[PDB]
């Protein structure tokens, strides 16, 4: 955004779009290189009361895999999951 108006007009005609609204070169609109210092918050476990680790352990709740059939009725046939629902068409740009 420093070129003269003739060059901007010829450029806009040749491109077919408006390039002055969206320039690929950054300018003073970007964020400043210096910022105020932040204050990051704490998580949900930063408490002084009722914070026992045995009640919120993640690794210790893992279990060995549940072995079902091992070699040491008229039930229905079963799939691994119900069949996936049919995908709906896009309502924004259906291209149809």
């Amino acid at each position: 955004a420093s070129a003269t108006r003739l060059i901007q007009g010829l450029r806009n005609w040749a491109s077919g779009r408006d390039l002055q609204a969206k320039l690929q070169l950054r300018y003073q609109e970007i964020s400043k290189r210096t910022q105020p210092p932040p204050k990051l918050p704490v998580g949900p476990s930063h408490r002084l009361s009722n914070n026992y680790y045995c009640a919120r352990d993640g690794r210790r709740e893992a279990m060995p895999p549940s072995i079902v059939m091992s070699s040491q009725s008229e039930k229905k046939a079963v799939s691994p999951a119900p069949p996936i629902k049919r995908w709906e068409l896009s309502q924004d740009e259906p291209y149809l």
Partner: protein, 176 residues
């Protein structure tokens, strides 16, 4: 949740067929591509003038390694060997012994820059902020063994870039 890309059916009427035939015989979209190149001819190029015009960076940048000091002259490292235990490429070699005043200080601190992957595990596993990854990246050498930094080179780099390393740490220490 899906769209039918490239399934549009072309028209059939005489005006659109004449338009398509005119585009075929007169090459309209080739002129469109020529016009787009001509538009890109008249823009400001994004080329910076190195080495007078350095590219933008961040205070978190990882480059050459350095050893810091306390603000009294004492070197910060107390030879805890966390950095060589967390270095994934085993670039850090540490050997330590008690010195004259009984302080736990290093005797050998070697970083192989050709082994180092520049990921900042050592600068984030250091409990006393001793080893840091400075912002310098223009340190290419002409010989392989010059990229084998001992303790003296790292201490000299720390004394050379302390005035920048301290400012970068002061900028970025609240995110850690």
């Amino acid at each position: 949740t899906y769209k039918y890309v490239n399934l549009r059916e072309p028209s059939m009427d005489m005006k659109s067929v004449t338009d398509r035939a005119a585009q075929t015989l007169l090459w309209t979209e080739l002129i469109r591509g020529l016009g787009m190149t001509l538009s890109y001819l008249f823009r400001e190029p994004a080329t910076i003038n190195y080495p007078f015009e350095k590219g933008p960076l961040s205070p978190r940048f990882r480059g050459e390694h350095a050893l810091r000091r306390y603000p009294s002259g004492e070197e910060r490292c107390i030879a805890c060997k966390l950095c060589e235990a967390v270095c994934p490429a085993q670039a850090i070699t540490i050997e330590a012994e008690p010195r004259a005043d009984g302080s736990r200080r290093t005797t050998r601190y070697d970083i192989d820059m050709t082994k180092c992957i520049y990921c900042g595990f050592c600068q984030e596993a250091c409990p006393v902020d001793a080893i840091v990854e400075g912002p310098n990246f223009e340190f290419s050498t002409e010989t392989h063994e010059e990229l084998l930094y001992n303790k003296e080179k790292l201490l000299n780099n720390g004394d050379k870039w302390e005035a920048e390393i301290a400012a970068n740490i002061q900028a970025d220490y609240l995110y850690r």
